[PDB]
Amino acid sequence: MDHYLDIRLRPDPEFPPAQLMSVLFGKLHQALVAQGGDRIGVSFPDLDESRSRLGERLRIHASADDLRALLARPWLEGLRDHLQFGEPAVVPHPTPYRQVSRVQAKSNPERLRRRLMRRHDLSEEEARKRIPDTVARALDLPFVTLRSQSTGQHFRLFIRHGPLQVTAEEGGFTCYGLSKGGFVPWF
RNA sequence: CUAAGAAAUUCACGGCGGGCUUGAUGUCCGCGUCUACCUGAUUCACUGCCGUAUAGGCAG
Structure with missing residues (x-):
């Protein structure tokens, strides 16, 4: 958990960075499903809360053995043309900690x-009268x-x-990298 | 502080009966419409599960 790997999004003349982020997030989900483990934390270093922007930089948090297991997996093939891969450096000691959580919604009444x-x-x-169509959940x-x-x-x-x-205390991590009670440092 | 200031048009009404518009007609010769494009932007807010729950979570 003391190490981190930073992924920057190369600007793409054919694709906006949102679908590139989705593709790489699916690839890392598949990589974590194949590899296993529950100590992989995700981070958005440039997350903008003003317009709910994902950002143009990605930070993944893991241990040294977990990071080398992830980079040893051949999931990285087919995606090097759009990303940067730095080095598994130790996270800074004076860093505030925050949690990441997957917030789902009941947007479909049916x-x-x-x-x-x-x-x-x-x-x-009976279900139509019990559940109106205005119960859809909109998330910003x-x-x-x-x-x-x-x-x-x-x-x-x-x-x-x-x-x-x-x-931060000890916690778990899901297959998406989202924390089920864990924390990731902020810097 | 206005060519300022003011105001009841209104009662009643039978428009109709009749009629052959018809004869004839060459539109027409000629014609280079080209050239060059990411539809897609997170545009599938979807399927299932825990819970009586619309309250609120969870799964890929």
């Missing part, structure tokens, strides 16, 4: 209507649009950075 059909055996009009959070190998539907994954703390 999914929950189908769910309550499978839970309470209600009819179509940065997001990435990806499709999964298990389910081919394209899903949107919101990423939100927590408040700055002064210390």
